[PDB]
UniProtKB/Swiss-Prot annotation, chain A:
CDD domains: MPN_RPN7_8. The modification N6-acetyllysine is found at residues 200, 210. This is 26S proteasome non-ATPase regulatory subunit 7. It comes from Homo sapiens (Human). GO terms for biological process: proteasome-mediated ubiquitin-dependent protein catabolic process. Component of the 26S proteasome, a multiprotein complex involved in the ATP-dependent degradation of ubiquitinated proteins. This complex plays a key role in the maintenance of protein homeostasis by removing misfolded or damaged proteins, which could impair cellular functions, and by removing proteins whose functions are no longer required. Therefore, the proteasome participates in numerous cellular processes, including cell cycle progression, apoptosis, or DNA damage repair. Pfam families: JAB, MitMem_reg.
From Swiss-Prot, chain B:
Component of the 19S proteasome regulatory particle complex. The 26S proteasome consists of a 20S core particle (CP) and two 19S regulatory subunits (RP). The regulatory particle is made of a lid composed of 9 subunits, a base containing 6 ATPases including PSMC3 and few additional components. Interacts with PAAF1. Component of the 26S proteasome, a multiprotein complex involved in the ATP-dependent degradation of ubiquitinated proteins. This complex plays a key role in the maintenance of protein homeostasis by removing misfolded or damaged proteins, which could impair cellular functions, and by removing proteins whose functions are no longer required. Therefore, the proteasome participates in numerous cellular processes, including cell cycle progression, apoptosis, or DNA damage repair. It is found in: Cytoplasm; Nucleus. This is 26S proteasome regulatory subunit 6A. It comes from the Eukaryota. Belongs to the AAA ATPase family. The chain holds residues 75 to 147 of 439 of the full protein. The gene is PSMC3.
From Swiss-Prot, chain C:
The keyword Cell cycle does not apply. The 2 UIM motifs are involved in the binding to a multi-ubiquitin chain in a cooperative way. Keywords: Isopeptide bond, Phosphoprotein, Proteasome, Repeat, Ubl conjugation. Belongs to the proteasome subunit S5A family. The keyword Transport does not apply. One of its GO terms (molecular function) is RNA binding. Residues 5-188 form the VWFA domain. This is 26S proteasome non-ATPase regulatory subunit 4.
Swiss-Prot record, chain D:
Residues 14-39 are annotated as: Disordered. Component of the 19S proteasome regulatory particle complex. The 26S proteasome consists of a 20S core particle (CP) and two 19S regulatory subunits (RP). The regulatory particle is made of a lid composed of 9 subunits including PSMD3, a base containing 6 ATPases and few additional components. Interacts with UBQLN1 (via ubiquitin-like domain). Interacts with ERCC6. Belongs to the proteasome subunit S3 family. Residues 15-39 have a biased composition (Basic and acidic residues). This is 26S proteasome non-ATPase regulatory subunit 3.
Length: 286, 53, 191, 39, 139, 287, 50, 94
């Protein structure tokens, strides 16, 4: 299907504004709308979004309303302002992927035959990216239920347009990884990556709590992947692998050695260049 | 409208130019008497057929 | 008049396609709406109608819209197939009122019951219970020759109008081929 | 290299006040041009 | 904030610019450039322009309102485009020339050979010809 | 009787819409309506902005369409929250920030319906990284100038903080219209959901970047220092001569090994430090 | 009937001319080198739709 | 059954457990690999068969508890390597 879905900052912001605009109830309620955007070379881009009215009682989650006329009427407005953008999917806060959001996609399947739903939290206090993009994929089997239809995840990242980036960076003026070198990498990928790995691993452990207190009767497939995960663990570091590592870890140190030595020489010449400067100035002065 | 129409013409000083190519993708390309070319999208207050290159 | 908004609740059950009135209970339904939607309009030149299917699940065709022709045309291609889920049907119409146009329109929904109705009472009282809480009166019209007098809705409608709550009323039709015509007059007259 | 930078911050001493060309000349010229620009 | 003043001075670049020409640098922070409108202007160079590109006569972009170096464009041209094969190649072999070996050899030894075997000329000591005239009867 | 402390707060989101629409029609002058709420007799705050369809060819803001205005306004209310049109914005591609003759004429129309309407100009080309360039404006009455009495009745040193742009001053700045200070509202939920989201990655940290290609990159870079270093020797003897300004100008046509050599060294040390470090970090995380 | 015809002319008084030149090179996606066929060489942008 | 560390099934150790002669186990391993059901290589010098990936199967309720152990012993190892960098790289952060 689609390899990845890029979400522009404007759409991200128009969803936070939507929740606060209607979230006067306070306790809890999702918010659902319709996404707009365009894609090229099998890579989706989402730029604009508008709010579609949507209500649903909590009990017996098979009741909900989405205004088709509002979707059709408003899209006539957005089409006039910008013709390039056409409906591509829908969004909803829905932190936990509520169950009823598998027949809703059928409602929006009319306007976009291959639509994607992006769940974007409005109240994020976490470390991961707050944009999960799912696509509908169909396959019926004899294990789950006679009617089988499940979402498949597509990697999503926050994009940036030339005009939006100007505003986005102006709006922050709060913190930036200035001098983006060894300092940002040691923190933007190494430490953060470990944090994510732990959380995902902890997520797996939480599900495995079913061993004692069964929640679902062994999903079967989840176990299959977990078995493959363990086999894929790098082979014990005791064989010829250890020699290969040293022959490469040390090989990288020579370049570091050479780079440092060149750095010292240039640093020493720089001090000489400056030191002779003030000595010459002082000598002439007195 | 005539009051507004005369207002543009009321600026009597015109800049004589020679029509270069009466393109039909009913537009006109002119060459003012200052060695400047242009692409007037709308011909203006003149017929599109009375103007020959 | 009185700035009313009605949200029609159409029926398309599989046993609803038998013609015991004249052109089967599909044209009998289509003529029935025509004599109400136009009747629903023409009093206040700002009204609103919406047709909702009572098929297996949430099936809504046209939303809150002042136009009149959309509903009629949208009624076609509504060939009946399946069972009727009344209990979860009104609530869907219920939400449509909540997300309405300018809220200064009085809210009501006329029901178009039909092929054998299914309910367990008790819950129906709760179904009528909530709607009667929030400035809502429903209009279930007995039709399709359900059990005589439909003594399951009887415990339903009275709940809304209970405590001297004058409003919409249950309307029944003879099992014989009684043409729909203006026979529907209890709600339109004064309720 | 760390030591080298250690002696780098000593040399700077009273070397910041260095006007490029001048101050009065630029200001006077700008004011005259602005007055004529309006009319 | 230094990183913020650097990203704020770029406003002087802007889209609408007039391509000029670099003539000579008078001192650091200043230079002499020639505008395509036809003139020679004394402008001030931006403090972020890599001076390594400030070569002899080259392409430099000047601010519209007040001429001032704001970029260094890659080399280009207007009425001279290299022949990119396609249908714009001559389509004539050396075997289609009616036996002009002596003339054919001379052009080979003065144009084609130096480009390929450049290092040989230095080794022998000859100075490669720097342009060949082709004069003769009409046809 | 204005208060010369208007301080039109715009948004953390209305600005992005203004810029996106401005850049979309960069050659032309797109126009739209601002949906904000008056709060004080001293401040006017905008919350949301929606665009108006372009009439067609022509770089102008000639007129607004009444029917389109109503249709969208009557449609946003039923889902969002009611808002009243407080001003209109049109994007100047690269001219600057001011009001032209047509823009002034269109502006008095809005002021007629609403007394305190605010006109905004957004420039999508001049704004680059940290400067957005808006400079919202408003009209001054011709009667006052005929009367000669200065308007805005300044009662605080708040409006005279931004020096008017000379380009804007050439036009009817402080003559046919007066600028109003513009600031922004920012909250952590907005910021944390934008700053901590824009440039991030999920798992790229523990990726060893094509170990075969890594050393090849090192060889090419290091080999460049072999020739670069040699030119460094030739760049030290001829230096430290008379007229260093002459020396300074002498480095305007030829690569300077002093800076070029350092640039390569910087990339070399970080690439291996990161690349090497991930090697040991991975060797413990996975078995 | 003539009033409608006159209105058409009034709809053309707001359309201005455009300088004519030929593209020389494409520096980037939004930057071009164009020489107006009267005078100097300019680096100018490009309309998104085009 | 064998832990991933050893996985050095010898030719004899396979024939005995399947009732084949030593001079025939070779066709068995290829048959398994041909279908795509196990992955590995065959070394007919020391008479060894390497296995690297046996197709996953079902684990009723006890081998899944053991799977929990291998995640606890692994989450805690990754946890330690996180604070190690965070503590010795306090200056390089934020
Ligand atoms: Zn304007």
């Amino acid at each position: 299907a689609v390899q990845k879905v890029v979400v522009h900052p404007l759409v991200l912001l128009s969803v936070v504004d939507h929740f606060n605009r209607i979230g006067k109830v306070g306790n809890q309620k999702r918010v659902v709308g319709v996404l707009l955007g365009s894609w090229q070379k099998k890579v989706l881009d989402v730029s604009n979004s508008f709010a579609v009215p949507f209500d649903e009682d909590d009990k017996d989650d098979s009741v909900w309303f989405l205004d088709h006329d509002y979707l059709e009427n408003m899209y006539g407005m957005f089409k006039k302002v910008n013709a390039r953008e056409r409906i591509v999917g829908w969004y909803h806060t829905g932190p936990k992927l509520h169950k009823n959001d598998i027949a809703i996609n059928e409602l929006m399947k009319r306007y976009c035959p291959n639509s994607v739903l992006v769940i974007i939290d409005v109240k994020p206090k976490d470390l991961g990216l707050p944009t999960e993009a799912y696509i509908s994929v169909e396959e019926v089997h004899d294990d789950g239920t006679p009617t089988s239809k499940t979402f498949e995840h597509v990697t999503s990242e926050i994009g940036a347009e030339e005009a939006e980036e100007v505003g986005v960076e102006h709006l922050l003026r709060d913190i930036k990884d200035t001098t983006v070198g060894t300092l940002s990498q040691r923190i933007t990928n190494q430490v953060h990556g470990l944090k994510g790995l732990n959380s995902k691993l902890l997520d797996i452990r939480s599900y495995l709590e079913k061993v004692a207190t069964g929640k679902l009767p062994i999903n079967h497939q989840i176990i299959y992947q977990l078995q493959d995960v363990f086999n894929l663990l790098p082979d014990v570091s005791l064989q010829e692998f250890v020699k290969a590592f040293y022959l490469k870890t040390n090989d990288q140190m020579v370049v570091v050695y050479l780079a440092s030595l060149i750095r010292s020489v240039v640093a020493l010449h720089n001090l000489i260049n400056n030191k002779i400067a003030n000595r010459d100035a002082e000598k002439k002065e007195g | 409208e005539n009051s507004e129409k005369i207002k543009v013409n009321k600026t009597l000083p015109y800049l004589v130019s020679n029509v270069i190519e009466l393109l039909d993708v009913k537009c006109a390309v002119i060459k003012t008497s200052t060695r400047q070319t242009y692409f007037l999208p709308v011909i203006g207050l003149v017929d599109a057929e009375k103007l020959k290159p | 008049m009185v700035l009313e908004s009605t949200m029609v609740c159409v029926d398309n059950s599989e046993y609803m396609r038998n013609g015991d009135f004249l052109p089967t209970r599909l044209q009998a339904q289509q003529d029935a709406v025509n004599i109400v939607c136009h009747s629903k309009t023409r009093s206040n030149p700002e009204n609103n109608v919406g047709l909702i299917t009572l098929a297996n699940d949430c099936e809504v065709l046209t939303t809150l819209t002042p136009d009149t022709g959309r509903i009629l045309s949208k009624l076609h291609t509504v060939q009946p197939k399946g069972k009727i889920t009344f209990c979860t049907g009104i609530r869907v119409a219920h939400l449509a009122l909540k997300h309405r146009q300018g809220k200064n329109h009085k809210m009501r929904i006329i029901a178009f019951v039909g092929s054998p109705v299914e309910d367990n009472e008790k819950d129906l009282v709760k179904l009528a219970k909530r709607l009667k809480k929030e400035k809502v009166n429903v209009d279930i019209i007995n039709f399709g020759e359900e059990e005589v007098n439909t003594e399951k809705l009887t415990a339903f409608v009275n709940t809304l109008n209970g405590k001297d709550g004058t409003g919409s009323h249950l309307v029944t039709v003879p099992p014989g081929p009684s043409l729909a015509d203006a026979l529907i007059s209890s709600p339109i007259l004064a309720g | 290299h760390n030591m080298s930078v250690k002696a780098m911050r000593f040399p700077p001493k009273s070397y910041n006040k260095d006007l490029e060309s001048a101050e009065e000349r630029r200001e006077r010229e700008q004011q005259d041009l602005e007055f004529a620009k309006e009319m | 904030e230094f990183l913020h003043a650097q990203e704020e001075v770029k406003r002087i670049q802007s889209i609408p610019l007039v391509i000029g020409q670099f003539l000579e640098a008078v001192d650091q922070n200043t230079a002499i450039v020639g505008s395509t409108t036809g003139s020679n202007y004394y402008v001030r160079i931006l403090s972020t322009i890599d001076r390594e590109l400030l070569k002899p006569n080259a392409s430099v972009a000047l601010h519209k309102h007040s001429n001032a170096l704001v970029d260094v464009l890659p080399p280009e041209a207007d009425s001279s485009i290299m022949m990119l094969t396609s249908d714009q190649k001559p389509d004539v072999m050396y075997a289609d020339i009616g036996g002009m070996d002596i003339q054919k050899q001379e052009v080979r030894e003065a144009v084609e050979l130096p480009l390929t075997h450049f290092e040989l000329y230095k080794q022998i000591g000859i100075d490669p010809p720097r342009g060949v005239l082709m004069y003769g009867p009409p046809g | 009787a204005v208060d010369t402390a208007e301080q039109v707060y715009i948004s953390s989101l209305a600005l992005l819409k203004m810029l996106k629409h401005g850049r979309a029609g960069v050659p032309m002058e797109v126009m739209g309506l601002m949906l904000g709420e008056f709060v004080d007799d001293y401040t006017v705050r905008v919350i949301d902005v929606f665009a108006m369809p372009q009439s067609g060819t022509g770089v102008s803001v000639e007129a607004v369409d009444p029917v389109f205005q109503a249709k969208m306004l009557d449609m946003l209310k039923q889902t969002g929250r009611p808002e009243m049109v407080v001003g209109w914005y049109h994007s100047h591609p690269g001219f600057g920030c001011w009001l032209s003759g047509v823009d002034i004429n269109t502006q008095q129309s809005f002021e007629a319906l609403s007394e305190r309407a605010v006109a905004v100009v957004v420039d999508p080309i001049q704004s680059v990284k940290g400067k957005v360039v808006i400079d919202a404006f408003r009209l001054i009455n011709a009667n006052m100038m005929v009367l000669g009495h200065e308007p805005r009745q300044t009662t605080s040193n708040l409006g005279h903080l931004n020096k008017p742009s000379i380009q804007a001053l050439i036009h009817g700045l402080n003559r046919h219209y007066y600028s109003i200070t513009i600031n922004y509202r920012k909250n952590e939920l907005e910021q944390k959901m934008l700053l901590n989201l824009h440039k991030k990655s999920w798992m790229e940290g523990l990726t060893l970047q094509d170990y075969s290609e890594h050393c090849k990159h090192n060889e090419s870079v290091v080999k460049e220092m072999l020739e670069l270093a040699k030119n460094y020797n030739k760049a030290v003897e001829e230096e430290d001569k008379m007229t260093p300004e002459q020396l300074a100008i002498k480095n305007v046509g030829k690569q300077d090994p002093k800076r070029h050599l350092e640039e390569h060294v910087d990339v070399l040390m970080t690439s291996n430090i990161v690349q090497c470090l991930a090697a040991m970090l991975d060797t413990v995380v996975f078995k | 009937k003539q009033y409608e015809k006159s209105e058409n002319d009034l709809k053309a008084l707001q359309s201005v001319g455009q300088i004519v030149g030929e593209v020389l090179k494409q520096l980037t996606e939004e930057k071009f080198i164009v020489k107006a066929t009267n005078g100097p060489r300019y680096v100018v942008g490009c309309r998104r739709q085009l | 059954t064998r832990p991933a560390n050893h996985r050095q099934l010898t030719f004899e150790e396979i024939a005995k457990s399947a009732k084949i002669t030593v001079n025939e186990v070779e066709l068995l391993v290829m048959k398994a690999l041909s279908v795509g059901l196990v992955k590995g290589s065959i070394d007919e010098v020391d008479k060894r068969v390497h296995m690297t990936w046996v197709q996953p199967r079902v684990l009723d309720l006890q081998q899944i508890k053991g799977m929990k152990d291998r995640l606890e012993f692994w989450c805690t190892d990754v946890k330690s390597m996180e604070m190690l960098v965070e503590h010795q790289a306090h200056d390089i952060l934020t």
